[PDB]
Design a binder for these strands. Structure first.
Lengths: 101, 220, 46, 131, 343
RNA sequence: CACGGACCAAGGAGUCUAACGUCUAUGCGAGUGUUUGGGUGUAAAACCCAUACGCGUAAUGAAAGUGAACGUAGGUUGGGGCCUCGCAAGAGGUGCACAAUCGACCGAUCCUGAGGAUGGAUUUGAGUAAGAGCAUAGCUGUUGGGACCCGAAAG
RNA sequence: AAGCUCGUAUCAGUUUUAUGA
């Protein structure tokens, strides 16, 4: 499932963790929102997962649906986020309708 | 078969499998018997929703999975004090298996796809519900159909059914009752079932108190 | 058409309202109870 | 006093993770008994025989109970008859599992029992012979 | 019945054929069993080492005795050599015999339960079809069509390595085969001069039903290991006791996996073996907890963090305002003076 | 008091194994244990397995034997829990393990003597109440192995 | 150290009254 994915990477290895001297844990899986890693803040444990990234100057917001657990090739569905800040935050909001705050 | 075409990993053969199931449901001369074939059909339709993730196509898919109670045995034949004549006889076998599928499935649905099956079971209860028949009265359809709702999904004298689906039916059957559009219908006998559940001891408090507040507290 | 709320989240609003309207009514009937309680304490100290 | 399970079986840790939630939110003393029982060691979770389940259902007015063994349900070849009852446990042995299913009743896991009986209505918790 | 798995061709295209899940991928994924079985199994392919029986005893030393104004360690006899009049037969001494000379009869190999060992491999197979577990383990499996990845049986017939690597590159294991080869490093220890000079990452497993030149085709491309389905090594499946290797199955192998392990319909092929039962129904807890059911039989919620009731002690006698919340009569006491009262 | 210390580097002392337990974990469970072996293998790895054997599963005795239901495998009392009533506080019912009390079955008693029938006298029990073990691993104890390390008068 | 009943009226390096040499 996903609880079984989490516990096996919480301890017993998430092989992309950085243990900071602060005791903090950082998932470097390029698709996580918080650079830190915690339960449903890292993109492997969670099944519904949104993120903003940049490939060029174009800032896309990637989105991961549990529908696509079978196929990892097309996991992250992505949408361009205009360029003006105000309309982009509004653009963000509509995609995040009926999700976690 | 259709259990390999509705449970495919390809989107196009699942849409085309739904359309060939539309032609297969308007080909009524082959769907005469064999309950477990209808059970396999609802398991294939269960997976056919299970691979759909995006919200607009899963609402279109829920609306057309409800509509499959409409293409299969449309009302046009519109039988006269005719008991169960090839639009109402086999239809009940297409209903029960669906609930049986959900009676098999309520453990195995995760916390992210369970909204698809709450919304799906809303549309399908509305659609069987809409096909009592085109009018809301057909009397042996009411008591035989209510026997093949009562005897499986709100049993509530058996723990084999999962307790989240009767409380969800309690949450939906009023608004989805009056999606049919103050009239008088066989509603109260349905409500008598819930009164039977309040009459039934040897159960858990949730069925007893959650219908006893949620269903009976409605002023409608 | 238009997007609809999840049937867990729909329930959430409903059950939250059920608790919230209960809580607000419980709170409002406690401000009056503490006001009456204050009067009892005042006359006892006198 | 015992706080956490010594077990490393993560599925047992998931049941603890579930029943700790139901221990404080239900405030019924059924869940506190089960959640205490999951922490227990292997010697202190003795195997309840299918014969002890049969003895337990001879109990008057216990025809429609869901018997719950926190340990393991094990088969007994000596008895012939067995009632149609829902039995809940961690481990059903292949022999015992087959015996309950063929008799008519079901064999269910503890989280299935957590769903069907959250507060724990109409149940019976059996324990194996320790001495 | 299960979802079902699409088989890809050597061009990386989805063929219309589909295969049912062998129900080994519905085994309990047990990290604790895999760990405690791997540690015992990794000890088995291990040789003996021992220090010599004669070493330290190949000296003719004698203790000098009491009251000689020198330490009582047995010293070597003779003369005029430098080695005369110095310590032997002692763990602290130079050229002396070590404490607890390592003997050959140490417990090198570990006995395991055969059923526990089988459980571990079933768990290890189950973890190969998770995709997130594979990504966590390592394995660049972002650009691969589906999991578990099943390729057509014609993959076995490939003779030449050039064509065999072209099959994997077309599938999508290109990134995983570039992870290996770029990860070739020198061993960081004394392992350099003990025939463990180089160390690299683990690539994909390639599971076949029967060989038609595939074992030889892939035995040169670095990282790629092959295994016959009948075997399926735990050390290959869960390397370093970490679950979920990226496994490329073949069509014939994937169908044979039903026979090899067993399911509800098919038998087992292993004598008196069955796949283990889950002690839970669902491997996730939060569907159970955030149900329509449980949240109905539950008392209302808190704030997840308490509002701090009385954080600091304000004292009455001083601070007028707190002396009004305690004792509302103090207002009346101040108005009438009351302490300043005439008789 | 006395024994040790000129200074510095490096070396340097509770180890390994067998026998027998302790507790915890894991697997399965009235069973359990692949690895003496054979088959197989990308080769001391891994993967399969025949026939046996080990330990446990049904007891009461000294040479000879017998054998566990008057039985919801018991009558009562308690007894975690659960159910009904009550806002609660309580009360009533059913009661797990377990404990207390009254007994029985089985074998063994003190006699009655039809080779020992039969009825009485009473208690007894790693007895039956209606199985909990086997194996691996970890923690550690006991004893033997040179046995935490070094140091004695010897034959 | 752990398991079992309980969480109490289970007790206390104490005082008091009561009843003897």
């Amino acid at each position: 499932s996903d609880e079984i994915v989490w516990q096996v990477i919480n301890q017993s290895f998430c092989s992309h963790r950085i243990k900071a001297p602060n005791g903090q844990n950082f998932c470097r899986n390029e698709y996580n929102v918080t650079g830190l890693c915690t339960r449903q803040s890292c993109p492997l444990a969670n099944s519904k997962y949104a993120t903003v990234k940049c490939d060029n100057g174009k800032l896309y917001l990637y989105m991961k649906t549990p529908e696509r657990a079978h196929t990892p090739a097309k996991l992250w569905e992505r949408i361009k986020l205009s360029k003006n800040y105000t309309k982009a935050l509004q653009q963000i909001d509509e995609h995040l309708l009926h999700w976690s705050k | 078969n259709f259990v390999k075409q509705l449970s495919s990993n390809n989107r196009k053969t699942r849409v085309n499998a739904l359309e060939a199931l539309k032609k297969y449901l308007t080909a009524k001369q082959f769907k005469e018997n064999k309950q477990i074939e209808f059970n396999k059909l609802w398991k294939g339709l269960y997976y056919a929703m299970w691979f759909s993730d995006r919200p607009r196509p899963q609402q279109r898919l829920a609306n057309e999975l409800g509509e499959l109670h409409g293409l299969y045995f449309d009302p046009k034949d519109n039988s006269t004090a005719d008991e169960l004549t090839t639009n109402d006889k086999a239809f009940i076998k297409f209903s029960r298996g669906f609930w049986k599928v959900m009676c098999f499935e309520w453990f195995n649905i995760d916390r992210y796809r369970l909204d698809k099956y709450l919304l799906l079971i809303r549309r399908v209860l509305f659609s069987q519900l809409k096909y009592l028949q085109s009018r809301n009265w057909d009397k042996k359809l009411v008591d035989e159909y209510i026997k093949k709702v009562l005897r499986w999904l709100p049993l509530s004298g058996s723990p084999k059914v999962y307790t989240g689906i009767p409380i969800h039916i309690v949450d939906i059957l009023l608004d989805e009752w009056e999606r049919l559009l103050a009239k008088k219908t066989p509603l109260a006998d349905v409500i008598a079932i819930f009164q039977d559940i309040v009459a039934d001891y040897n159960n858990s408090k949730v069925l007893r108190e959650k219908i006893k507040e949620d269903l009976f507290s409605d002023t409608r | 058409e238009k997007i609809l709320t999840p049937e867990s989240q729909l329930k959430k609003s409903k059950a939250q309202q059920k608790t919230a309207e209960q809580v607000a009514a419980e709170r409002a009937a406690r401000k009056a109870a503490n006001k009456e309680k204050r009067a009892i304490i005042l006359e006892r100290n006198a | 006093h015992r706080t956490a399970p010594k077990s490393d079986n993560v599925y047992l840790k998931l049941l603890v993770k579930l029943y700790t939630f139901l221990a404080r939110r239900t405030d019924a003393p059924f869940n506190k008994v089960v959640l205490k029982a999951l922490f227990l060691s292997k010697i202190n979770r003795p195997p309840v025989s299918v014969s002890r389940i049969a003895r337990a259902l001879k109990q008057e007015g216990a025809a429609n109970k869901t018997v719950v063994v926190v340990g393991t349900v094990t088969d007994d070849a000596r008895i012939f008859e067995f009632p149609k009852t829902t039995v809940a446990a961690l481990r059903f042995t292949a022999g015992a599992r087959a015996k309950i299913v063929k008799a008519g009743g079901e064999c269910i896991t503890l989280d299935q029992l957590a769903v069907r009986a959250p507060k724990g209505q109409n149940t019976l918790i059996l324990r194996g012979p320790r001495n | 019945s299960r979802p079902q798995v699409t088989v890809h061709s050597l061009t990386g295209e989805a063929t219309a054929n589909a295969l049912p899940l062998p129900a080994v991928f519905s085994a309990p994924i047990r990290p604790d069993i895999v760990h405690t079985v791997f540690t015992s199994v990794n000890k088995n392919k291990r040789q003996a080492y021992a220090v010599s029986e004669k070493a330290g005893h190949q000296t003719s030393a004698e203790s000098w005795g009491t009251g000689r104004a020198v330490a009582r360690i047995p010293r070597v006899g003779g003369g005029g050599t430098g080695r005369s009049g110095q310590g032997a037969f002692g763990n602290m001494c130079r050229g002396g015999r070590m404490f607890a000379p390592t003997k050959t009869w140490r417990k090198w190999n570990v006995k395991v339960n055969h059923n526990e060992k089988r459980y571990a491999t079933a768990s290890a197979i189950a973890a190969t079809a998770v995709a997130s577990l594979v990504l966590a383990r390592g394995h660049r499996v972002e650009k691969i069509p589906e999991i578990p990845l099943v390729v057509s049986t014609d993959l076995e017939s490939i003779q030449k390595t050039k064509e065999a690597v072209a099959a994997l590159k077309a599938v999508g294991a290109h990134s995983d085969l570039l992870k290996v080869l770029k990860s070739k490093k020198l061993r960081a220890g004394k392992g350099k001069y003990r025939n463990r000079r180089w160390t690299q990452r683990r690539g994909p497993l390639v599971v076949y039903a029967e060989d038609n030149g595939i074992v030889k085709a892939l035995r040169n491309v670095p990282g790629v290991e092959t295994a016959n389905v009948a075997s399926l090594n735990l050390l290959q499946l869960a390397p370093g006791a970490h679950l979920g290797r990226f496994v490329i199955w073949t069509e014939a192998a994937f169908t044979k996996l039903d026979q090899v392990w067993g399911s509800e319909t098919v038998a087992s092929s292993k004598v008196g073996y069955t796949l283990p039962s889950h002690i839970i129904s669902t491997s996730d807890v939060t569907r159970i907890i955030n149900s329509s059911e449980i949240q109905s039989a539950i008392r209302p919620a808190g704030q997840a963090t308490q509002k701090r009731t009385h954080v600091l002690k304000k004292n009455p006698l001083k601070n007028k305002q707190v002396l009004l919340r305690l004792n509302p009569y103090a207002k009346v006491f101040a108005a009438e003076k009351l302490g300043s009262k005439k008789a």
